[PDB]
């Protein structure tokens, strides 16, 4: 189709070389928002689990300033290998430096790229399979209860049904301590050019889902991209 493998996907969309492209603009909004959540709003703790990391690291760049350990996870093993190639500095890993430096810019140019990169590499110790449909999304791997579960652009796409979505939210809860943070970033797609129907139009329905899944909402913001910060009840 429009990309052949996870690396082709990365080369097509994450090179960050054109400031006015649709991809750069989306990526800047996601990134400003993650900097706000993890650096300004002080969402912080010891263990963060990243759900649907795919082959990308952009969603972890501000987070690694706030969490001691980050576990990266994905349903697709091929996504994880591409990710590992970068973490291990293996040959011909994707070049994340442009996105890395952008984030260093947002954070006030207190650090240059390599130091930031090294801090994320040190934070990441486990690279695991996740299946949001499973009562134990990480299967049989034991992991202490976490202080944060982060899901950027995964849940809406991973769950066709509202009932699937709700169960995933409860499945994710099983990975968290009481009081533990849930950070979702996702899109509420418009009806334009749409074939078939979608979970939401829309703020109210996403909130109800999160609340009824067992969380209290601390904040919800449109960026149709949205960010939501919740705490497990």
């Amino acid at each position: 189709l429009s990309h052949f493998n996870p690396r082709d996907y990365l080369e097509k969309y994450y090179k960050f070389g054109s400031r006015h492209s649709a991809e750069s603009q989306i990526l800047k909004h996601l990134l400003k928002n993650l900097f706000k959540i993890f650096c300004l709003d002080g969402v912080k703790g010891d263990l963060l689990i990243d759900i649907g990391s795919g082959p990308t690291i952009y969603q972890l760049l501000s987070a690694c300033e706030s969490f001691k350990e980050i576990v990266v996870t994905d349903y697709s093993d091929q996504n994880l290998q591409e990710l590992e190639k970068w973490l291990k500095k293996e040959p011909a890993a994707f070049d994340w430096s442009p996105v890395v430096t952008y984030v260093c810019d947002l954070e006030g140019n207190r650090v240059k790229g390599p130091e930031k990169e090294e801090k994320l590499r040190q934070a990441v110790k486990q690279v695991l399979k996740c299946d949001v449909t499973q009562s134990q999304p990480l299967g049989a791997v034991p992991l202490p209860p976490a202080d944060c579960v982060l899901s950027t652009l995964c849940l809406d796409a991973a769950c066709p049904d509202l009932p699937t979505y709700c169960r995933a939210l409860r499945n994710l809860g099983s990975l968290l301590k009481p009081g533990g943070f849930l950070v979702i970033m996702d899109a509420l797609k418009s009806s334009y050019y749409m074939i078939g129907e979608q979970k939401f139009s829309g703020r109210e329905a996403v909130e109800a889902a999160v609340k009824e899944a067992g969380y209290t909402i601390e904040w919800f913001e449109v960026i149709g991209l949205f960010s939501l910060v919740a705490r497990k009840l």
Binding site: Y9, I26, Q78, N79, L153, C154
Partner: peptide, 9 residues
Amino acid sequence: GFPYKPXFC
């Protein structure tokens, strides 16, 4: 797909 990730995109 962007900004969905494989294999959703």
